[PDB]
Amino acid sequence: RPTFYRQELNKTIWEVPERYQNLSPVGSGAYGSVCAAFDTKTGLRVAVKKLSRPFQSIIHAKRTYRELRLLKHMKHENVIGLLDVFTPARSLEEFNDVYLVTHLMGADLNNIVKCQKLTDDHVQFLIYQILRGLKYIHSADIIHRDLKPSNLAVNEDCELKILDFGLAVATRWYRAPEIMLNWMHYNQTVDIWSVGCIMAELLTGRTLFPGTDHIDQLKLILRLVGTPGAELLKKISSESARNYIQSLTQMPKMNFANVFIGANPLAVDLLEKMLVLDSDKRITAAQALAHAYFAQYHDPDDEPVADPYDQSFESRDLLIDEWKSLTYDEVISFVPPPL
Template sequence: MSKRVRPGYYRQEVNKTTWEVPDRYRDLRQVGTGAYGTVCSAVDSRTSTKVAIKKLYRPFQTELFAKRAYRELRLLKHMKHENVIGLLDVFTADLSLDRFHDFYLVMPYMGTDLGKLMKLQRLSEEKIQYLVYQMLKGLKVKNSLKTHNRESDFNCSVDEINILDFGLARQADSEMTGYVVTRWYRAPEVILSWMHYTQTVDIWSVGCIMAEMLQGKPLFKGSDHLDQLTEIMKITGTPTQEFISKLESDDAKSYIKSLPKVEKKDLQKVFSTANPQAVCVLECMLLLDPECRVTAAEALSLPYFSEFRETEEETEAQPYDHSLDNTDLPLDQWKRHTFTEILSFKPVLPESKETSL
């Protein structure tokens, strides 16, 4: 006999998965699936807005899964910033801790991604400035959060608040969570696992997205990993000896040394019809060496963004309490902490801000 549905909730099968959600969320439709969960779009009847609801896949099947689920919830609760997707709601249909098996995260639905937007129209100079400025503000928050946390394995929790989650990116790969940046936007150090990632790994992606806005087509359109690298080096030139010596992989070193030497292209000539200040931004972002790329905070101070700058708005994240993040707890304790976080969630009522997109 199937268990009764919690009052105020209803049960629906979505692609062979049972969803139990509050009555306010209607018209559930699966929009993505990955290793850790499934995402449905829905209409919130209270606000008449479209939302994305994520159901984690068996969040308490192991201590590792439970810790990951707890951290994801804590991070999303912590992020309250207009440029980073925030948590609108979190709920469970399970009435007590001993019956607690599943929970759901509700976030804004990012329906129009930049890819669709660019197919519809060529973006104006002002719109490009605005969109890149917004992405950089969001990245600055994300990077400050990671700095406060100072964890080497922090990236596994941050995929939820990546550039792609700002609703400004293309069709995502199906691997991992379904929110991973496609090859055309990946930083070279990610493509070949050259070296330890730094915070500028996302700056490369922003540079690729900005270049596409200016050109109306992707800048680096590789057909596979190595072709992607070849396309990148046609613009950046082949790496210097100084950069090659920083690589951690001997295979990567020997591969790069075997490549024919290519000179760096002058981006002012590649983007000859673009605003020179916009090209200056790209020059600072699209550098092979992650240590030479601008940070989000540095990029925000470039002249191209001067008319949008409101420095008091370029906030950093409040320090994140990660006292439990490095601990190993038994499964039932992760469960208890997660249940408490769900019960203590206070939704922030969204202001009705219409964007000019």
């Protein structure tokens, strides 16, 4: 067991191993707080996240377990992974805090773009990387569900990593129309919709669908891609949703070539394949990587898939101490990567 030291940064108490030095606050969210630090063992700048109230309830306890299990499984260049996970506790009985450590990333895509058009080479490279990560995540039967610029970490070398996947600027702006409609059987291509929205924004410098609420969001979407055709209407079970949808003034799909005129025609073609209303007809991450737009980056021998990921715990109804003990087990069993 390493030697820990304690300090207060903002209102939060940080108790970490002495290997981590020079902690300085970087951000805060509902799920936890983050500090930048220097890892003396590796010479790397790292980000350290202290989870907030991880075992306050069964809900929080299961979430904490879900997050740790997911992060321990993600091992890919374009997905955030773990360098370390620790707790100051020396036994299960005093286990109350969980800290996660990863490579410090400089900014998010939102901050990077702020707020102009990127060059076509940068769009190619950033989107390629999102898709490469997404192929990996999807191969493990994981749906991200909340892909947006603020969940994409990017360094000054344009290296990109997907953050907080499978843990489920307004989020609704990047959400698939079937999610606005509350379809309970949406699939992994909801993530491809989000990528299409991100890509459009990198090309134009403007949010593609800046909806003010869920109904407005769906309206803006249909304005561009058109109201649903016959084949898609057949797939909608809900009578109320069909009545609503069929009662909108019908609109044809816009010509993407004109909407995004000036962009690389290959980028336009790919956007057309990503922003398809019927999710069953959207391009997959694997297919997208093979699209001619990424000719300069695609290497089928270096776009790996993930090891199988067991999410059976999601259907379990356990006690708060049981989720806590499983989490403790996952902390103790952690093996750091080669480095």
